Amino acid sequence: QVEQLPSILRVQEGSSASINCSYEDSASNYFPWYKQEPGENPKLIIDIRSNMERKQTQGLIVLLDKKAKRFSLHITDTQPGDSAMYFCAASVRNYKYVFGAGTRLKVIADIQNPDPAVYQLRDSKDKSVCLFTDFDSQTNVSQSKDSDVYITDKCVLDMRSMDFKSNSAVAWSNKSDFACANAFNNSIIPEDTFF
């Protein structure tokens, strides 16, 4: 039976992240690691056998200490997009894959040039939605303290094309007394909301 720590791992972009696992059978011979993107299937990312104590391939490092019955995975220079669910396992002979319960890795992104703004969208005919966007990593969109006003959590986008990341959160309501001016009374970065 295999213990994997931690369950949730919040790491800042650029920093390294490590997952540790330990297993309870002297006999285990193979230690694979699986990455799992939302909706998809776990995919083998790297593995190590009882023959060896460290392996580095494919942007990944694994350690194995047979004596301590501990093994670990190490990702240096995390980027959003390493954000996924990881799983370790220990196997014996031709059968028996025992898995950790997994680590949800969240890589928090370094907004380089923040541009906090709150804009008002429309379409088709509620009618109106508000967008809080381009704010820095250290901001919390809080939930709606108004019922019948809905606010999503922040969403991090990373482009492959350019080195620009952005945060966004969406808020909407059917009420007549609703506007973007005073919608996001969380701890806003002190800018914009310009109409």
Partner: protein, 241 residues
């Protein structure tokens, strides 16, 4: 690789559900696992050449696994209960191989009552004039609201091809009535394009939400439309001024 069907399954309490897995051309190929938020990856059962070897992880009641032939395996749950709700992964490995290959699994949601299943209403919102002016970028937003349960897949289609780069979808939906445990959900997504791209009125944007609900087999008493598995979409065209 390993093919599992269905990808999503909604059942009511006490319905029977069977899950299908086609391994790869290989021997040790049952490795049914259950995947949940609380218990993580849990071994259920294992077959070598159609032969039950370990069923240690299987619930002691209602759950059963078979291999009819050597190219398919089934998990049958009798009298589905809410606690049965999880993702059911299936996996296979070869002879002289350590590598284990996983399926994408079947997501099972067992509901108390199928009268509370509703499909999403989808709407897309055109970028802000302010945003365009300030950043030279245009962000479209899509809203899927009022759906239960939370088996939705949201995609962005630009001129008939699905796109990914510049999409951001909420990783988890929000409860419209968060006090209640059994509440409808909303999901939002954003598509960010250049202001130039949005300003071209030949560009067609479509937000599409695949919802999973009742099959055509299921009965429908209520006087609204039966909430079958369906796609719900909303479109917008580029605009010059």
């Amino acid at each position: 690789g390993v093919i599992q069907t269905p990808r999503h399954k909604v059942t009511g309490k006490g319905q029977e559900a069977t899950l299908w897995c086609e391994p790869i051309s290989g021997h040790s190929a049952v490795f049914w696992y259950r995947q949940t938020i609380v218990q993580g990856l849990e071994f259920l059962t294992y077959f070598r050449n159609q032969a039950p070897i370990d069923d240690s992880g299987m619930p002691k009641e209602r759950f059963s696994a078979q291999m009819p032939n050597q190219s398919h395996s089934t998990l049958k749950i009798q009298s589905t209960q809410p606690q049965d709700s999880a993702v059911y992964l299936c996996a296979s490995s070869r002879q002289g191989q350590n590598t284990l290959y996983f399926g994408a699994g079947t997501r099972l949601s067992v509901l108390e009552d199928l009268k509370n299943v509703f499909p999403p209403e989808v709407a897309v919102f055109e970028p802000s004039e302010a945003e365009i002016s300030h950043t030279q970028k245009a962000t479209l937003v899509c809203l899927a609201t009022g759906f239960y349960p939370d088996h939705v897949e949201l995609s962005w289609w630009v001129n008939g091809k699905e796109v990914h780069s510049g999409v951001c979808t909420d990783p988890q939906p929000l409860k419209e009535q968060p006090a209640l445990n059994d509440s409808r959900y909303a999901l939002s997504s954003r598509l960010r394009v250049s202001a130039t791209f949005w300003q071209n009125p030949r560009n067609h944007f479509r937000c599409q939400v695949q919802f999973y609900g009742l099959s055509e087999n299921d009965e429908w008493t209520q006087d609204r439309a039966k909430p079958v598995t369906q796609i719900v979409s909303a479109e917008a065209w580029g605009r010059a001024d």
